Paper text:
Global resolution was 3.9 Å for the monomer and 4.6 Å for the dimer by gold standard FSC using a 0.143 cutoff. Coulomb potential map of the monomer was slightly larger than the predicted model, indicating an additional density attached to the N‐terminus (red dotted circle). Using MS analysis, we confirmed that this density was caused by the uncleaved GST tag. We observed that a 56‐residue loop (MID‐loop, aa 386–441) in the MID domain is disordered and could not be modeled. The [name] [name] domain forms an inverted Y‐shape conformation wherein the C‐lobe is situated close to the N‐lobe small subdomain, the putative binding site for the E2‐conjugating enzyme. Superimposition of the [name] domains of [name] monomer and dimer reveals the movement of the [name] domain C‐lobe by 17.2° which in turn causes the catalytic cysteine (C876) to slant by 14.7°.
[name] is a tumor suppressor E3 ligase that has been reported to inhibit breast cancer cell proliferation through 26S proteasome‐mediated degradation of RAC1. Here, we report the cryo‐EM structures of monomeric and dimeric [name] along with in vitro biochemical assays.
Residue numbers in the entry: 1 to 385, 442 to 906
The structure:
């Protein structure tokens, strides 16, 4: 058979060293003298031949200071151990490690070996130098049935290890149940404390173990704390261990309520309790409602106490909100059936809303009363006015946030609560006193209320009379201190996402590289690199933007063209000729947010119209001057003379090239047959402006916004106008006043030093920086200069100069501008008081309408 080699050569090695020889005088050879023979099952014959000998095993061999008796416990034979025990070989003799032969047979499971040592009265209590013993060694090793056969021979089981831990305390820490099954049968103590008071119970919950804690309760363990007071319960929380907590509750239902009281404990990890409750909510519906209803009684308590003027603000204020993010989170998970998964809570299925929101309503009735005060206050105090607005308005704004957080749970994604709406209009006169009191509360408490887009759409009540010098700080303050739509605050960190740039053609190459790379991966110092060239750590970056700036307007690509003013750029309507047409546009919009979000500027300026579309704003008829003034004039004739005197009627459906034939298409959808009624030409002026650009462009423009919106929240930059926006991109320009004085050209009636003009510039010197800059746009659109300055005016109608002309009339009329000529136009203001009254007043309303 296969193991016959072992059968034969067990007899052979007897012959090969048959003649007897005494063991070595040295410690190195004795292990060499017998170790193969013991393994080779000579254990009986060696016990026969070494019955006559003169050496002892305890003269330990080699560096390790072990014995063959340790090997005797290893290799698993007794008949040699018969003779070894006749010699009196001390089992409790130890290595340098302090270990025994027993631990080997324990480690190896040689049962009969473990027996005979105790027949020699082995001191089991001798721990090694590490402080661990056999019984400890086995429970961890999960070897129980021997431990039944072992522990029976001793009564000192309670005797601890070096540190005080019993094997029972160990097994619970490891979850070795059947081990524990035997130890208790063998007379183990249950509530035996460690030095710290740690029962085996405390150890199990630390480990997150279920089934053993079930058992200790059956056999009648006790729920106790440690020395410092920490319970088993606080562990499973800190562990996130849900199912173990469920077991305790079957035997101590008082604990459920204790959980709920933990949520107002600041020290805990909110992202652990979600594991617990979200688990128990799924456990059963009869538990489910008890949870939500139980949460609210804490909320209703804290709120009335929050409104109490004695309570400290910041403490309770999180303690409330620390609850509701779950309470919202649970309802969107919805009612889960008894011992079964989720149910929706649809109509007819018990109306969860009928009960759970009920305890709260006192909070909202309580709420409205204070606001009713303030209305009577503000209305009746307006002539004779610490003020409660100054004192406690910070508090209420905590609660109003609670009223959007709750109501938006019982509506679908992205859909507004109607009940919230009516609440706003009732008190709209009051809320405006808070925003003017503190504008940037809008970022913290009223965040979603006024920056969720469809609400921002609806809640323009406030966004206008939102003060505007607020914006003046906020070109930069809410860029540098962030723009908190949850993400313009901190960045991720990314290193190994390097871009290989193709210097020879960056545009087409980088089109690919970006569309691969992911979004948040690029909100950091971008790893700009070329093919096989380091160049610079990051200073190379600026080449990438600055160069792409001129390559988008690379006219051979046919993306953009100049205005009639020759200075500003706009998208080419006939760009449809391209084979690949739209995909390039998407590349652009991805750029600008990165120039923005990393707050480095760009040198290009576009036409004023193109900004109005980005902000979703409508166009006016002046915006046609970029493409062709003649239509703008032709549209002006319509306003110059009403249709009452008109003989040539217009059609509301006109031949137009849209990258096709001169197709006559309706100006209004379907109503292409009507004509210019006296009450209808306003729309005719309107749609010719819109649908000349829109219909030709709208497939193009949108791809730009998909990427520009990718890295930017649209809800924020509705903040800015169209005249504040171009400055974040190309920087606040420089203005030499003298250079602007010298290049003037006075004409059409005015002389260069009449009283009015001397008094004009007197007003300008009083003006700020962000208003003179808007004057320039009002007459040139363009907002910034070339190198040579105003002496090197780009002009556009040629490189012509900042010019002025007259339109004489009494001060009733206001200024006007002609852009392409880069000329200003002024009705006369015949006095310095007229100037000091009308001009100072006329410029502002003239320089911008609200």
């Amino acid at each position: 058979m296969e193991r016959a080699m072992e059968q034969l050569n067990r007899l052979t090695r007897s012959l090969r060293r048959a003649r007897t020889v005494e063991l070595p005088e040295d410690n190195e050879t004795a292990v060499y003298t017998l170790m193969p023979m013991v393994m080779a099952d000579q254990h009986r014959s060696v016990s026969e031949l070494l019955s006559n000998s003169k050496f002892d095993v305890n003269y330990a061999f080699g560096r390790v200071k072990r014995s063959l008796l340790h090997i005797a416990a290893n290799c698993g034979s007794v008949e040699c151990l018969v003779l070894l025990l006749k010699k009196g070989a001390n089992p409790n003799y130890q290595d340098i490690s302090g270990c025994t032969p027993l631990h080997l047979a324990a480690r190896n499971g040689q049962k009969k070996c473990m027996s005979k040592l105790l027949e020699y009265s082995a001191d089991v209590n001798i721990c090694n130098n590490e402080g661990l013993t056999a019984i400890h060694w086995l429970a961890v090793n999960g070897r129980t049935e021997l431990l039944h056969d072992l522990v029976q021979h001793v009564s000192d089981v309670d005797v601890e290890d070096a540190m005080g831990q019993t094997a029972l305390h160990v097994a619970c820490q490891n979850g070795h149940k059947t081990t524990v099954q035997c130890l208790l049968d063998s007379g183990a103590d249950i509530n035996r404390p460690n030095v710290s008071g740690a029962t085996p119970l405390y150890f199990a919950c630390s480990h997150g173990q279920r089934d053993t804690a079930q058992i200790l309760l059956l056999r009648g363990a006790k729920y106790l704390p440690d020395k410092n007071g920490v319970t088993p319960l606080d562990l499973c929380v800190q562990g996130g261990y849900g199912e173990t907590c469920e077991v305790l509750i079957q035997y101590h239902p008082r604990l459920f309520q204790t959980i709920i009281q933990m949520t107002q404990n600041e020290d805990l990890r909110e992202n652990m309790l979600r594991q617990v409750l979200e688990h128990l909510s799924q456990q059963s519906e009869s538990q489910y409602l008890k949870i939500l209803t139980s949460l609210a009684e804490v909320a209703t308590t804290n709120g009335h106490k929050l409104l109490s003027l004695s309570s400290n603000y910041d403490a309770q204020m999180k303690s409330l909100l620390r609850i509701v993010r779950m309470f919202c989170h649970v309802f969107r998970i919805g009612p889960s059936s008894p011992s079964n998964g989720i149910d929706m809570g649809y109509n007819g299925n018990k109306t969860p809303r009928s009960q759970v929101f009920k305890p709260l309503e006192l909070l909202w009735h309580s709420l409205d009363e204070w606001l009713v005060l303030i209305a009577t206050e503000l209305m009746k105090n307006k002539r004779d006015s610490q003020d409660v607005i100054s004192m406690t308005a910070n508090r209420l704004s905590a609660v109003i946030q609670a009223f959007y957080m709750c109501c938006s749970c019982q509506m679908p994604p992205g859909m507004t609560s109607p009940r919230f709406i009516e609440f706003v209009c009732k008190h709209d006169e009051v809320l405006k006193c808070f925003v003017n009191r503190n504008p940037k509360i809008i970022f913290d408490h009223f965040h979603f209320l006024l920056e969720c887009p469809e609400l921002m759409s609806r809640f323009m009540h406030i966004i206008k009379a939102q003060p505007f010098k607020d914006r003046c700080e906020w070109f930069y303050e809410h860029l540098h201190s962030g723009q908190p739509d949850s993400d313009m605050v901190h960045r991720p960190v990314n290193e190994n996402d390097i871009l290989l740039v193709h210097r020879d053609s960056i545009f087409r190459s980088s089109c690919e590289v970006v569309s691969k790379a992911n979004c948040a991966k690029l909100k950091q110092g971008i790893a700009v690199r070329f093919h096989g060239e380091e160049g610079m750590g990051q200073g190379v970056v600026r080449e990438w933007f600055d160069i792409l700036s001129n390559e988008i307007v690379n006219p051979d690509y046919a993306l953009f063209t100049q205005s009639a003013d020759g200075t500003t750029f706009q998208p080419n309507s006939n760009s449809y000729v391209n084979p690949d047409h739209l995909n390039y546009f998407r590349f652009a919009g991805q750029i600008l947010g990165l120039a923005l979000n990393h707050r480095q500027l760009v040198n290009i300026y576009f036409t004023r119209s193109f900004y109005k579309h980005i902000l979703g704003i409508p166009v006016n008829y002046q915006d046609v001057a970029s493409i062709d003034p003649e239509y703008a004039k032709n549209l002006q004739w319509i306003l110059d003379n009403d249709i009452s005197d008109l003989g040539l009627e217009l059609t509301f459906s006109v031949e137009t090239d849209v990258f096709g034939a001169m197709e006559e298409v309706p100006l209004k959808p379907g109503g292409g047959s009507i004509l210019v009624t006296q009450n209808n030409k306003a729309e005719y002026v309107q749609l010719v402006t819109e649908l000349r650009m829109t219909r030709a462009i709208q497939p193009q423009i949108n791809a730009f916004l998909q990427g520009f919106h990718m890295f930017i929240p649209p809800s924020l930059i509705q903040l800015f106008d169209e005249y504040e926006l171009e400055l974040l991109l190309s920087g606040m320009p420089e203005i030499d006043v003298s250079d602007w004085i010298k290049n003037t050209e006075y004409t059409s009636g005015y002389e260069r030093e009449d009283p009015v003009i001397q008094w004009f510039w007197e007003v300008v010197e009083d003006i700020t920086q962000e208003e003179r800059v808007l004057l320039l746009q009002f007459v040139t659109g363009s907002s910034r200069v070339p190198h040579g300055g105003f002496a090197n005016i780009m002009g556009g109608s040629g490189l012509q100069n900042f010019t002025i002309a007259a339109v004489p009339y009494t001060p009733n009329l206001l200024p006007t501008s002609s852009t392409c000529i880069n000329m200003l136009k002024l009705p006369e203001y015949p006095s310095k008081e007229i100037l000091k009254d009308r001009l100072l007043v006329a410029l502002h309303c003239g320089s911008y309408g609200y």
